[PDB]
Amino acid sequence: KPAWCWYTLAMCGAGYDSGTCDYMYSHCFGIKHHSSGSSSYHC
Ligand SMILES: *[C@@H]1O[C@H](CO)[C@@H](O)[C@H](O)[C@H]1NC(C)=O
Ligand SMILES: *[C@@H]1O[C@H](CO)[C@@H](O)[C@H](O)[C@H]1NC(C)=O
């Protein structure tokens, strides 16, 4: 199986704001907060 997520972090080391990590990392998880819309707000 592929391996680009954690990989992007592995090379990081311990950063909290660089480029690939902050991007790939965040996206790797995410919390329904992408440019689109909430779950079910304002019926
Ligand atoms: C991101 O983390 C810090 C940025 O200050 C640095 O050590 C590192 O080189 C940057 N880039 C990557 C790929 O980690
Ligand atoms: C809004 O959606 C809910 C379902 O979660 C529904 O019960 C309700 O009738 C809809 N309209 C209003 C005014 O809440």
Swiss-Prot record:
The set of disulfide-linked cysteines is C5-C28, C12-C21
GO biological process, alphabetically ordered? defense response to Gram-positive bacterium; killing of cells of another organism
Where on this protein are sugars attached?
Answer: S18, C43
Q: Is Nucleotide-binding given among the entry's keywords? A: no
**What GO terms fall under cellular component here?**
extracellular region
> Which controlled-vocabulary keywords does the entry list?
Antibiotic, Antimicrobial, Bacteriocin, Disulfide bond, Glycoprotein, Secreted, Signal
Main subcellular location of this protein, as a coarse class: secreted
User: What's its job?
Assistant: Has antibacterial activity against L.plantarum ATCC 8014. In purified form, the activity is bacteriostatic (IC(50)=2 nM) rather than bactericidal.
List the protein's name: Bacteriocin glycocin F
Source organism = Lactiplantibacillus plantarum (Lactobacillus plantarum)
Shown residues in whole-protein numbering: 22 to 64 of 64
